[PDB]
Structures are given as structure tokens and as C-alpha cells.
Amino acid sequence: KYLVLALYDYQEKSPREVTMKKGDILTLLNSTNKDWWKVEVNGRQGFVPAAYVKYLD
């Protein structure tokens, strides 16, 4: 179970990004990069800013 909470809305601005809404619980796919985390939201995968999510533990 690897979940993150969206702390802010984020609208995708480049091809491999995804959009999320504040309060969404996203599945974390890859957190190897310090700035951009790969997540799954609404049937879609892609990157959001690491700073805009909180790892749930």
C-alpha cells in the first residue's frame, strides 16, 4: 500500500504529467526523483511535484 495525499490541486503542464485535486489519495508508483513523483490518479499515471503530495504512513 503506497499512498500519497494531494496537498494542492495540480494541473498537468507537460506530456508526462498528470492532474490531481487537493485531498485526492494517489497511488505512489516511483519516488526516486527528489522533485517529481510518478503517481496514479483517475485511471491515469504520470508525474506531479513531490512537494505537493504527502506520503501517508
Side-chain angles (χ1 to χ4, degrees):
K1 184 201 95 299
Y2 295 87
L3 310 171
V4 299
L5 170 71
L7 299 177
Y8 311 99
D9 295 341
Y10 184 72
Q11 190 178 349
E12 69 199 59
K13 291 172 196 174
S14 80
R16 293 247 190 196
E17 300 178 15
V18 65
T19 285
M20 57 187 189
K21 294 196 182 278
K22 183 181 176 195
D24 284 347
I25 300 299
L26 306 194
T27 293
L28 172 67
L29 301 174
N30 184 311
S31 57
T32 59
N33 187 270
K34 195 174 80 47
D35 295 321
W36 288 98
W37 288 1
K38 197 188 182 172
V39 292
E40 178 172 78
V41 196
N42 307 133
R44 305 178 67 214
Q45 299 181 1
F47 292 92
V48 295
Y52 290 19
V53 296
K54 176 182 191 82
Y55 184 57
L56 293 174
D57 53 18

